[PDB]
Design an enzyme around this catalytic site. Structure first.
Site, short mmCIF file in Angstrom:
data_model
loop_
_atom_site.label_atom_id
_atom_site.label_comp_id
_atom_site.label_asym_id
_atom_site.label_seq_id
_atom_site.Cartn_x
_atom_site.Cartn_y
_atom_site.Cartn_z
N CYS A 1 47.28 -10.59 49.65
CA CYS A 1 45.86 -10.34 49.43
C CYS A 1 45.01 -11.60 49.58
O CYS A 1 43.80 -11.49 49.55
CB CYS A 1 45.65 -9.71 48.05
SG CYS A 1 45.89 -10.80 46.62
N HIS B 1 43.47 -30.92 51.72
CA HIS B 1 44.83 -30.43 52.06
C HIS B 1 45.35 -29.48 50.99
O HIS B 1 46.54 -29.16 50.94
CB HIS B 1 45.86 -31.56 52.20
CG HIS B 1 45.83 -32.31 53.51
ND1 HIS B 1 46.52 -33.49 53.70
CD2 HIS B 1 45.21 -32.04 54.68
CE1 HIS B 1 46.34 -33.90 54.95
NE2 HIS B 1 45.54 -33.05 55.56
N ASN C 1 42.78 -51.00 50.77
CA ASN C 1 44.14 -50.59 51.05
C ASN C 1 45.02 -51.81 51.15
O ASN C 1 44.55 -52.96 51.14
CB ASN C 1 44.23 -49.71 52.30
CG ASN C 1 43.69 -50.39 53.55
OD1 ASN C 1 44.04 -51.53 53.87
ND2 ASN C 1 42.85 -49.67 54.29
N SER D 1 43.31 -45.72 55.90
CA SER D 1 42.49 -46.48 56.86
C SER D 1 41.46 -45.62 57.59
O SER D 1 41.72 -44.46 57.91
CB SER D 1 43.40 -47.13 57.89
OG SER D 1 42.63 -47.76 58.91
ZN LIG Z 1 48.16 -10.66 46.02
#
Ligand SMILES: [Zn+2]
Lengths: 261, 8
Positions: free
Chosen positions: A131, A120, A237, A213
């Protein structure tokens, strides 16, 4: 049974460890999801989207600046440390340990883990909106205009920082607006990362799921593939199980160092 | 490409 798990652990040549928000909540690190997971009036769902960033980039940057700043006092916990030291020890024996983390706090890196896939993104990377360049950034404050901003109180005034003075790209020609290199709600996970993760999961012979989980995401994307190769899966957990692979209930900073020693 | 949290 910890003994049965440890018999697999002793033999495993390739361990994949998937980690979710439970392992970062135990370092004191707010998620912003659920009851009291508020920052000012908002929850993470409201802010971690391209629509929020397009419409109010100053507000979204205040939120991410607060999060970056709060990391300074939050420290890796015994679970992160056990995982990192396990990787180092096993690596010397020619045995591989890889971490696939949903978490963007970089705590695994601070703990010492090397082989980490941040599916993530990371609070301490930027991406240029112009860019596309991705760059590490740990500066406090990330830009001068954000100094002392990001207070989490409901009645805090907005900084309303002109977009030109939010973090900008430092390639002299470019100067584009930077965004956090974090995957937001409504965006795709990086395909290259997922391919690498699939290769690791397919090669692994024991898989641990820590502070989340197997049944929900992201574990649900890969864990069935591992299970169907006959490979053991071990969940650590705080979630309960009824009377019904392995599940070690409790805070991971308690359970995991014993399991991984 | 995969949608963070399956869109839920
Ligand atoms: Zn840039």
């Amino acid at each position: 049974d910890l003994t049965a798990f440890r018999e697999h652990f002793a033999k495993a040549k390739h361990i994949a460890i998937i980690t979710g928000a439970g392992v970062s909540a135990e370092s004191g690190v707010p998620t912003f999801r659920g009851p009291g997971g508020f920052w000012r009036k908002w929850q993470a769902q409201d802010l971690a989207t391209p629509e929020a960033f397009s419409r109010d980039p100053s507000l979204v940057w205040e939120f991410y600046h607060y999060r970056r700043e709060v990391m300074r006092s939050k420290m890796p916990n015994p679970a992160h440390l056990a995982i990192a030291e396990c990787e180092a020890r096993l690596g010397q024996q020619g045995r591989s340990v890889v971490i696939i983390t949903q978490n963007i706090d970089e705590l695994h890196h601070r703990a010492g883990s090397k082989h980490v896939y941040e599916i993530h993104g990371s609070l301490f990377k930027t991406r240029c909106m112009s860019c596309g360049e991705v760059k590490a950034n740990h500066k406090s404050p990330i830009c001068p205009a954000l100094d002392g901003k990001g207070a989490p109180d409901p009645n805090t005034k907005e900084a309303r920082i002109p977009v030109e003075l939010l973090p900008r790209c430092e390639r002299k020609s470019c100067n584009g607006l930077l965004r956090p290199h974090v995957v937001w709600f409504g965006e795709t996970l990086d395909s290259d990362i997922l391919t690498a993760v699939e290769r690791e999961l397919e090669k692994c012979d024991l898989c641990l799921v820590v502070g989340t989980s197997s049944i929900v995401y992201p574990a649900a994307m890969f864990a069935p593939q591992v299970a169907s190769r006959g490979v053991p899966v071990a969940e650590f957990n705080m979630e309960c199980t009824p009377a019904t692979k392995y599940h070690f209930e409790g805070p991971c900073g308690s359970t995991l160092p014993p399991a991984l020693e | 490409g995969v949608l963070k949290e399956y869109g839920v």
